Design a protein around this ligand. Structure first.
Ligand SMILES: Cc1cccc(C2=C(c3ccc4ncccc4n3)CNN2)n1
Length: 299
């Protein structure tokens, strides 16, 4: 596996390890490399990706986990499909999207999250999973304009049998209110799903801003760009999200389009201070699916 892959270009670095663009038998693939001391993170992400029935079009396609000794030290590898466009973050910074395009990005993301959160009952069943670090930089855009979720290293799996998790972290900017004020019940798996929804609402806000209507659109911005410094601390985020109770601003322009109106509504229903009041990934997917069948465009 890793023995025949040739690294060609450095393309990114997440919380742990670094991502490279490799070549396997002539085919481009993405390789995430971890150091020996990062074995726990490497192992956990390999573990999540190897979850029974995890594969889904809206989830990064996992190829394999492997070790590679260069003669001095050993590298811990995770190999996956390669997606030229890169992260949703990079995509939205470089391009603007049409109504159909925005819907495809949002729907695919919601479908990907719904799959993760959904428990598949059966002999070869799939446990429910919460991501815990959803954001535009952890989502990838495929050549067909659809998104797939990546970086599952912090994910948690639920055992409905006894209602327990198999095991604050994540990106401060996208942390849900209950996480920022640390009021979240770590023992309740449902709380992790709801926190994921809050984050996805922020992502939907990033996409919508880039929806170019009649040549009109807003420039790319991360959520809360107008309220907190770059790389904000938990305290800075808490004061804005928890105390002042602010959320990303919804442009007036969005009212001149039924598509943006539906999106805007979904956003609000994702940002409720109380996770139990937020929409579900499935409900969101259904809503966007119907909105999609309206305009008319590939799902
Ligand atoms: C499990 C695994 C293997 C290799 C890379 C990744 C990964 C990411 C990834 C995947 C494909 C890419 N294609 C192009 C550019 C960046 C990419 N990043 C992002 N976060 N983790 N994950």
């Amino acid at each position: 596996i890793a023995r025949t892959i040739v690294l060609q270009e450095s393309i990114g670095k997440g919380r742990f390890g670094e991502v490279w663009r490799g070549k396997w038998r002539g085919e481009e693939v993405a390789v995430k490399i971890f150091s020996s001391r990062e074995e726990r993170s490497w192992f956990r992400e390999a573990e999540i990706y190897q979850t029974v029935m995890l594969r889904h079009e809206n989830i990064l396609g996992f190829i394999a986990a492997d070790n590679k000794d260069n003669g001095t030290w050993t590298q811990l590898w995770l190999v996956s499909d390669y997606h030229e466009h890169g992260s949703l973050f990079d995509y939205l910074n470089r391009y603007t999207v049409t109504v159909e395009g925005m819907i495809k990005l949002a729907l695919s993301t919601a479908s990907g999250l719904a799959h993760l959160h959904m428990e598949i009952v059966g002999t070869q069943g799939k446990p429910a999973i919460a991501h815990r670090d959803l954001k535009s930089k952890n989502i990838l855009v495929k050549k067909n304009g659809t998104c797939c979720i990546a970086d599952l290293g912090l994910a948690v799996r639920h055992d409905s049998a006894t209602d327990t998790i198999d095991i604050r972290v994540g990106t401060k900017r996208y942390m849900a209110p209950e996480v920022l004020d640390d009021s979240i019940n770590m023992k309740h798996f449902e709380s992790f799903k709801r926190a994921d929804i809050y984050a996805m609402g922020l992502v939907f806000w990033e996409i919508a801003r880039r929806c170019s209507i009649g040549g009109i659109h807003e420039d790319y911005q991360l959520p809360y760009y107008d309220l907190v410094p770059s790389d904000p601390s938990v305290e800075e985020m808490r004061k804005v999200v928890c105390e002042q109770k602010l959320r990303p601003n919804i442009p007036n322009r969005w009212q001149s389009c039924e598509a943006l109106r539906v999106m805007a509504k979904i956003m609000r229903e994702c940002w409720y201070a109380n996770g139990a009041a937020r929409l579900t990934a499935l409900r969101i997917k259904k809503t966007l699916s119907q909105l999609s069948q309206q305009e008319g465009i590939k799902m």
